[PDB]
Amino acid sequence: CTKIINADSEDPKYIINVKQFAKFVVDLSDQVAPTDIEEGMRVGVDRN
Amino acid sequence: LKELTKQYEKSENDLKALQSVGQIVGEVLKQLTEEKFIVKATNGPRYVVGCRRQLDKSKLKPGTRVALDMTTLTIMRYLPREVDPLVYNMSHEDPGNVSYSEIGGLSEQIRELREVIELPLTNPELFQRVGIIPPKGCLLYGPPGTGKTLLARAVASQLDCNFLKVVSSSIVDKYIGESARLIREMFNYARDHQPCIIFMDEIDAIGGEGTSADREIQRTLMELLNQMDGFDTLHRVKMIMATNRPDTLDPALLRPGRLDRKIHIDLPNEQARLDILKIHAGPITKHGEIDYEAIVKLSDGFNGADLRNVCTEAGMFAIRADHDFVVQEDFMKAVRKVADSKK
Amino acid sequence: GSELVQKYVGEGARMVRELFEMARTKKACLIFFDEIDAIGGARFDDGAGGDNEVQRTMLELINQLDNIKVLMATNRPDTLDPALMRPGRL
Amino acid sequence: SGVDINTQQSFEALSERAVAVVVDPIQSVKGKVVIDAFRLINANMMVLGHEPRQTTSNLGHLNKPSIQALIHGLNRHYYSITINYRKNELEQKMLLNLHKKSWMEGLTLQDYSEHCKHNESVVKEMLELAKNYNKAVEEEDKMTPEQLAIKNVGKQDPKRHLEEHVDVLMTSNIVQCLAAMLDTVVFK
Amino acid sequence: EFLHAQEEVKRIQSIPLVIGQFLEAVDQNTAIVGSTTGSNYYVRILSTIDRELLKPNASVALHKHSNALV
Amino acid sequence: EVLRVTHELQAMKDKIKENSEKIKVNKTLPYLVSNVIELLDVKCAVIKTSTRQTYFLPVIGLVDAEKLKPGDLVGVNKDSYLILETLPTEYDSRVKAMEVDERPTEQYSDIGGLDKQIQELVEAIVLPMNHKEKFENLGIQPPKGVLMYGPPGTGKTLLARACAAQTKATFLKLAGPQLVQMFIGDGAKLVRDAFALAKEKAPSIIFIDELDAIGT
Amino acid sequence: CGKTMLAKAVAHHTTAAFIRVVGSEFVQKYLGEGPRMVRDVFRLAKENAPAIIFIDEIDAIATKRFDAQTGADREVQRILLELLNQMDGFDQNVNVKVIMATNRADTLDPALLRPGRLDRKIEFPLPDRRQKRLIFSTIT
């Protein structure tokens, strides 16, 4: 997660780097909590 | 209602846009038949691609950028050539809107350079009426810093043509073949972007024996003379190739269609110092009267750049002070420090 | 030293970066660059090739260098970059 | 896909014959139309035979389970259904108007200048092909001539670039002459 | 039916088409041409295509989907 | 008649609502972070996606025209490759990490012998940055930059921090060996964001150490 | 004395595929690029036959061979040997004529002056009182 947008502090719209694939603006799945994902840390995203 | 009307029309345009889809930008490289092309994507494979019916066949020449559909793989519309400051050569540098009056005291030399270069590029009708191939190339020789480069930029500014400045001593690289390769790339570059002022710096490195490194200078010299006068396209670009030592220059490098007209630009002339100080110190705010003759006599053997440093450093003295240039003692100490500290 | 020169571009700089980061995470870490000449040759312009890749890895290493102590050994110290041999890194 | 699998499952909840078909617009770029219907097979029916069909003979007809679709799951999670298109008269006849020409077509005389140019070009290519035919026939080499006729097959001189070209030029010439005579008869 | 078959045979040369370099020939009606996409594919060859223009550098055109020398 | 206007207002309100719901349900996530290279006229932009593939757009999409500028980093659909929403820059976080304000205070008492060079830098910067009114009045254009060339160990980095110390400024250090990233279009974005940040802040100096990393 | 201009005239008057290369163009760095360029030039003449190769100022890369003691002279001697091999070697090129212009004619390698590689060694002397009249008449 290279950046956090924090559009309204409720739908942050995180930006994620998938290394070789591309850079995307994505959101969390309902399973994980908003506060667990801090800027720069490695995150795991689904293929879809 | 009216504001809602405007934003709703914009929203309907957005809704129509959502259905619209993108096209891969591609470049045409060949034309097999009147419905066949070889288009290469920017980063992608090459596809055999057709053209849309509402599109002119002729316009899609080899090198014409296109945006084909990414499902049917068919050209839909042409695009003009891509523009970006990705150029690796000096063409994108602007010589600067400097007039011929900015360089002072070279009126004769200025006139000869105009006659040599400006005439074939502005009014070739005289040269074709006489029946002579227009001259190309002028050789400016003189003490370093005298203003040959400024003269080249002034010509490139008045003619409103692209200008290439190159340090000739830099182009001779230790590795073999790159010295001539740089001249080759320079000339083929000038072919695409025309007209071109090919201003080359001190040529004594390139122009003017039993070792490989010495035969390298011979090879790059032959490449240069072939590029200026010879095969392929005789072209219309001009060269302002300037040197510091004219005797070193190869005699073959001095020919009419091969960089003739040895213009001598000696150190700023006795009356030229006054004009140079007028042009380079006038912009500087100075209400006090000037004893220019005293400065000129105190600046003997000075070069054109030295006067500009005198003006800038006098401004600096003012900066370290009130702010206004009022006294000649400043010009005196500026001249002295541009005399002893610039040695 | 061999690992710090990878086929893919930028991987050596990343390698040295995470090496230094792991060294910082540990308390009282020692780094010993045996045969520095592999990744410490004198700098020269060779852009049309992969030489500048290990060159940029060396530059990133110099950036990292200038509680951490660093060791380097070489039998030909005249081939090392003067910037790397200056007494701010060594 | 698995998402498609769930989507078909949800459709089957309302009715247990809710078919799902797929249409690929890119592979179906010509006369071939890649469109396969699918219905979910229940995962609880593994005790009995998948594709639970009965007395019939049309399982292998009209298709063979494709490799491109078998690996993504066929006869395991979902099974294909034979595709058949209901096309009847008063519908095909309207469709044939896509490329139907008209009464004007068939009477046009083409263009005589380019007709003569094409005829001359075909005649010249026939002259070169006849030189090749003369060489090949007069060669008549008899070291296993049956094997000679099979060691020189590359779609060449003997017959393929022979009368087939005569076929096209003769068809064009007779059609043009017949049309010209018909116009001289009908039009004054 | 024969003119029909010739027509669909010509249709396979429709103009979505990638280009690849004819690396090597294996035997009749097949090849190993590598596409410009970045991969080398073991392909099939049209009968209509004459084999003597299949020099082992030719930039032959391949079908977009089936990826066959067309 | 006011009830007629109210009815028209309510009808166009629900029309706005339905078009907004369509736009929202077509926005979704994710967006392909793409960098607009240029904008051709003949409402259509040439986008280069982060996937190292360029895609021409016949229409710009769910954005307004003059807001988009050449070089804007936006988010586009992964399939249709159409601009959905402009992505704010905020100068990342690494760029804001280089405005270091714990300057170790290289006072000119801590640098010796480099006196005339200190005065030359203070003639090139500081007074151009601090006492600029006289500089405009004279017409002396102050050089926007200085290149510190010298043998290693001379103290170029020291004097840089020195004139960043006793002359205030923000000191946005942009050292060269940092400015090489294996991610495509990150170093260039780093430089452009650094200059944009320098524009944003008060009088400052952009400092790049070891320019050879990109200056070859 | 008209060496390059005659080749220009030939190029303007040829039904073949004129391929001009300069001697300095073969001296590229990245060893294996100059001889490879010679290989590409002769191959390009080969497919588009008949073709004519005009190599101007050959004295740069066709000086007499010697005992080279560095990669510098070794590479230029390699270019000369590649020229020798492609002009007359195991692969005889047909309908590929070569015009070669030099200003020395004596530094040239004897293998390159063989009457199997450079058959006609035409000399272009300084114009006499007769040729000067013709040159003046044509230019004026």
Ligand SMILES: Nc1ncnc2c1ncn2[C@@H]1O[C@H](COP(=O)(O)OP(=O)(O)OP(=O)(O)O)[C@@H](O)[C@H]1O
């Ligand atoms: N003139 C000087 N006065 C005081 N200390 C100096 C001077 N020149 C160098 N030093 C000291 O020597 C060291 C040189 O490091 P510094 O990075 O400042 O120099 P540099 O020439 O810019 O280095 P490099 O070119 O290797 O990046 C520092 O520790 C610095 O304090």
Ligand SMILES: Nc1ncnc2c1ncn2[C@@H]1O[C@H](COP(=O)(O)OP(=O)(O)O)[C@@H](O)[C@H]1O
């Ligand atoms: N004769 C002159 N008149 C006015 N300015 C000059 C003159 N000669 C030099 N200069 C100043 O010196 C600067 C650099 O001179 P330059 O063109 O590099 O000299 P040279 O071409 O001899 O090296 C220019 O920006 C110009 O303002």
Ligand SMILES: Nc1ncnc2c1ncn2[C@@H]1O[C@H](COP(=O)(O)OP(=O)(O)O)[C@@H](O)[C@H]1O
């Ligand atoms: N017989 C001639 N008639 C007219 N011009 C000539 C003649 N011979 C040489 N020249 C001139 O000499 C110049 C040099 O050309 P050329 O002699 O062909 O090249 P090189 O000097 O490399 O042999 C040309 O510009 C040409 O105009």
Ligand SMILES: [Mg+2]
């Ligand atoms: Mg430093």
Ligand SMILES: [Mg+2]
């Ligand atoms: Mg010549």
Ligand SMILES: [Zn+2]
């Ligand atoms: Zn699906």
